[PDB]
Amino acid sequence: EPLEYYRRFLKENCRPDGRELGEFRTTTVNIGSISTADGSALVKLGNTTVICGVKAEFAAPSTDAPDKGYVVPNVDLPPLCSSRFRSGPPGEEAQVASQFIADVIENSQIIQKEDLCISPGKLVWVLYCDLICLDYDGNILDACTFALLAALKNVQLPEVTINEETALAEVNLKKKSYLNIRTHPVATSFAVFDDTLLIVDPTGEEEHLATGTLTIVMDEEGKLCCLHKPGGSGLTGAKLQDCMSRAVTRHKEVKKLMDEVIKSM
Amino acid sequence: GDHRRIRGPEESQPPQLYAADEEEAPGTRDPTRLRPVYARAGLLSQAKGSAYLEAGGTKVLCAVSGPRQAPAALRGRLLCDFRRAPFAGRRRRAPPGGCEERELALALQEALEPAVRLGRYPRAQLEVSALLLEDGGSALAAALTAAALALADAGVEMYDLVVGCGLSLAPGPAPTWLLDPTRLEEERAAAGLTVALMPVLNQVAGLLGSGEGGLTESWAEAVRLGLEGCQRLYPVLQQSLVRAARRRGAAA
């Protein structure tokens, strides 16, 4: 009798865990936990958990845009996250999340691909940002985006040079250089029950028994990078402006958190 | 081109191979030494049992998706998926793998089947899923230990725990067996070895090895040394499990 048990709390303006329908759960990060990787970031929202490792490599660009350093995300929902996933190739949710992360990276323009070209037409960086879920208690997109941004700030790259005599490039793993990122896109999630009831940061069950879901990415300068609205019972702008406000608030909060962290190092 | 992942570049080589330097060598140390170990069981929630182990730069998870319906024929099964995260190691490898992941998976299965008693889990397959977040030395042994912890945590029956230990060989003129090494001591090495046993009943469960060289007596000394290391390591894991059980008692 799950749904009924849940409507009782919903109408008491609460949830069975102790959250007031509009607040998230304990959000925490950990930077630089990993040496083998250029950038590393652990994120966890109470029970939900995500980890991003960003490696850096060389590669030859395309012919349409030689001055473009690729940024390739891939999300991994291994079977140890939840039992709804099975050992094998990637399912559907992983792939959807991957395309979401890529759309974000491409639209928010947090990073200029041009800032990754060493020798146009010949070399350019490729940033393989690999995200891994470890507890899919719910709201995996927020965690994925936040971990991506955190690690992608942690990343400091080496410096390379070109020798015309050898016609090859050399690296200097001693000196390095951080990675400039302009926008700080944060993602805020929503679960829409029958008609008008929007809860924020929905956990697992709340997403299992929901009529629809929503996600909204809100850049710092009062703009949006993505309004992910896969199906749902419907919405009018009045049930949407409020979500945008709450998204701005969450942006503020998590950016303050991330600043405190990068400064506590 | 894979149509289940994002369109990246065809090929991509790392920058290190384009470096110019003689990497630093470790030097000297106490051969019979062990790294500081942090082992905790009960980390993950959505899993019946989970465990986490850190030893130096080594960082490994293991989860146990429990019995899932699927005498000597109605005998349980356990299928293990070892998997190193693409952001571990100097080099990057696509997530799939298909060369060494499966070898180490076979190793885990061959080292766990003995300890676990599967007569009490018939018509069932236990999905063990290991994950290697960072490689910093003895990896397969950490994975064995973590899978053992995760199983013992989920409450599957057993006969004893599994303790692993990795060894390497110093290529110096006086080659000594180096215990619980680092990725540097392991890539600048001649031979490598891995033992795994059940210390109460003193029985190996799965071992492995390889060598630029060696000889019977040397391998035997290596074996006994790894056994002693595993013995000296066991109590940590004991205390970890006790601690997790106490936390459960606390929750209710």
């Binding site: 936990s33 990993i34 | 500081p36 942090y38 986490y52 940590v236």
Partner: peptide, 11 residues
């Protein structure tokens, strides 16, 4: 062997 603290999963 002595122990350490979780660089990644502290409690």
């Amino acid at each position: 062997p002595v122990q350490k603290q979780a660089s990644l999963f502290p409690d």
